[PDB]
Amino acid sequence: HQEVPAKFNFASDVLDHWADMEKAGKRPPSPALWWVNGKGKELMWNFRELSENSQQAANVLSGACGLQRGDRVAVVLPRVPEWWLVILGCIRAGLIFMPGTIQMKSTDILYRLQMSKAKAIVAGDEVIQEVDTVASECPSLRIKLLVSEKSCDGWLNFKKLLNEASTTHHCVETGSQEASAIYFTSGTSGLPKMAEHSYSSLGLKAKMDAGWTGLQASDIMWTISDTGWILNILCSLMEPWALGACTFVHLLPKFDPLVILKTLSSYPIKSMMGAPIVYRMLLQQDLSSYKFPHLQNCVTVGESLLPETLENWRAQTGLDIRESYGQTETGLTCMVSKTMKIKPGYMGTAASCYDVQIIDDKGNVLPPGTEGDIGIRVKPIRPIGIFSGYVDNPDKTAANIRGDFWLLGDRGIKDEDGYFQFMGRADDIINSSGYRIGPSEVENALMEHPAVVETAVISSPDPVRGEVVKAFVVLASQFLSHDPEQLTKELQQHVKSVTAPYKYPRKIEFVLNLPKTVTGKIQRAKLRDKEWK
Numbered sequence: 001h002q003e004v005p006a007k008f009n010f011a012s013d014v015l016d017h018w019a020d021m022e023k024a025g026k027r028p029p030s031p032a033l034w035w036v037n038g039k040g041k042e043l044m045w046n047f048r049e050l051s052e053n054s055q056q057a058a059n060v061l062s063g064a065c066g067l068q069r070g071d072r073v074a075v076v077l078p079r080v081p082e083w084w085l086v087i088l089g090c091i092r093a094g095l096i097f098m099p100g101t102i103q104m105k106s107t108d109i110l111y112r113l114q115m116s117k118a119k120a121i122v123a124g125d126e127v128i129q130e131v132d133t134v135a136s137e138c139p140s141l142r143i144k145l146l147v148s149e150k151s152c153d154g155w156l157n158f159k160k161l162l163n164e165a166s167t168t169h170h171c172v173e174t175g176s177q178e179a180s181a182i183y184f185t186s187g188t189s190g191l192p193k194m195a196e197h198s199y200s201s202l203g204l205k206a207k208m209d210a211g212w213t214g215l216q217a218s219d220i221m222w223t224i225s226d227t228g229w230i231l232n233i234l235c236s237l238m239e240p241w242a243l244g245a246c247t248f249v250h251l252l253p254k255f256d257p258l259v260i261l262k263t264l265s266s267y268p269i270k271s272m273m274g275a276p277i278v279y280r281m282l283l284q285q286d287l288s289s290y291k292f293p294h295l296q297n298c299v300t301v302g303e304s305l306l307p308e309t310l311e312n313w314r315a316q317t318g319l320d321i322r323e324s325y326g327q328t329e330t331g332l333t334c335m336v337s338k339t340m341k342i343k344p345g346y347m348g349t350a351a352s353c354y355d356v357q358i359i360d361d362k363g364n365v366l367p368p369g370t371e372g373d374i375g376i377r378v379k380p381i382r383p384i385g386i387f388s389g390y391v392d393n394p395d396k397t398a399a400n401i402r403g404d405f406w407l408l409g410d411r412g413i414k415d416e417d418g419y420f421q422f423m424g425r426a427d428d429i430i431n432s433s434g435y436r437i438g439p440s441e442v443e444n445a446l447m448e449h450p451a452v453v454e455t456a457v458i459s460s461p462d463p464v465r466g467e468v469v470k471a472f473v474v475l476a477s478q479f480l481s482h483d484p485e486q487l488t489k490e491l492q493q494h495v496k497s498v499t500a501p502y503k504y505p506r507k508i509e510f511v512l513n514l515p516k517t518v519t520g521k522i523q524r525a526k527l528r529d530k531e532w533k
């Protein structure tokens, strides 16, 4: 049970307010989206232009391609303006957007399209061939839209159709609880589940949290994110547009820290958001060389922000990094807001919607200073911002509910002021830099190679990255005197060729056997614990 309005839509109820203020003279033409590719190309939309161009996107999707309300649309694009336009187009047209990384390989794509029964895919040059290798095995797939300077056989040209579309689209009166997005998300075993979010659980939640980052109406925010991470919708798109502020996007084709640094320095970015890895990469560059006195707000999420990183960023930039915490299923769950005291090692207090607590094995609230499982209260009232459940899987949504709480699956401690301290994943999920990684994903990849008879993938501390994927591998006898160095590279490349490279095992250790339960199941917890002093 939720306490929401009957109807909500981020495009019509927020974005178009800002456009209408411009049309009617109440506000000057303000920048909404500012994009750069780093090679001398830039593009900017004001809120009216964004409204119009996104209405053209809705018309392409629902008119030219005839996609109907409730249809599921896979979106697999790099950091190009068309991503923002296509997501907004889906929201208007009542279509369910399902973003994924351009890193994906064909088997990743097959899995997503088959599991979701996607009716359409919107892709770029990066994944054409990957999609086409598997498209014919997907009987629900009816539309393929390509965003590219090139035309290609079998694919509709998105850019050409966008330009032909009317700038007037009548926004669908979408319901608050109505499906708006599906984000695939990795689990402790098996393959990614489909996390469904509603019009309100993304957009109304965003409108309510708007400003938490310290951003204001006339500022520019840069969210540095894979376009497949829920972070991109929540912070790159909805936070700034809730406030009438500009969002900044850099193609960052190669994710180069020096490019990031010159960008911060050269453009009047007032707020920035990124995973801790971003900050750690910048701290290795020459900060003295590229100053950014316009930068005021530095926020982070996705991984644990080490006190070490916080301290160094302060020392070198004079700025605080304010940590936040969440997951795909819950969005922004805790944070350090602008006016809150920073506590090194602590990821903040409850987001305004949420009763976040530390809880015991029977579902009860624990006192400050005691370790347990982090949760959000969802009975008898589910707060605005929680997802709708895992699609086609009511059992696995039930499995994460304990008493009245949704379990985030992270251990934690709460202090005397309500600040949460992350104490590690309670299960086998791995966190490598941005990304959330399911051990079965990497294990399946590894098992396809003939040198691997048995394997267990787990998380491993790394002094330069924080946390990385490690594979323990039992070799077939005939590989026992290969060069371990060379074989490791081979297996690493193997994984990179069969699934999205972010999950490759950056460490491998060869062993004669793995630990097993009394019914033969591999004990990852045991290996993990060893790996961490």
Ligand SMILES: Nc1ncnc2c1ncn2[C@@H]1O[C@H](COP(=O)(O)O)[C@@H](O)[C@H]1O
Residues within 6 Å of the ligand: 185, 230, 301, 302, 303, 304, 305, 323, 324, 325, 326, 327, 328, 329, 347, 408, 409, 410, 422, 425, 431, 435, 436
């Ligand atoms: N501030 C943080 N500290 C530690 N872990 C985090 C933090 N933010 C996110 N995570 C991890 O990332 C998971 C969510 O990943 P995703 O659902 O891909 O956004 C959480 O359950 C945590 O395990």
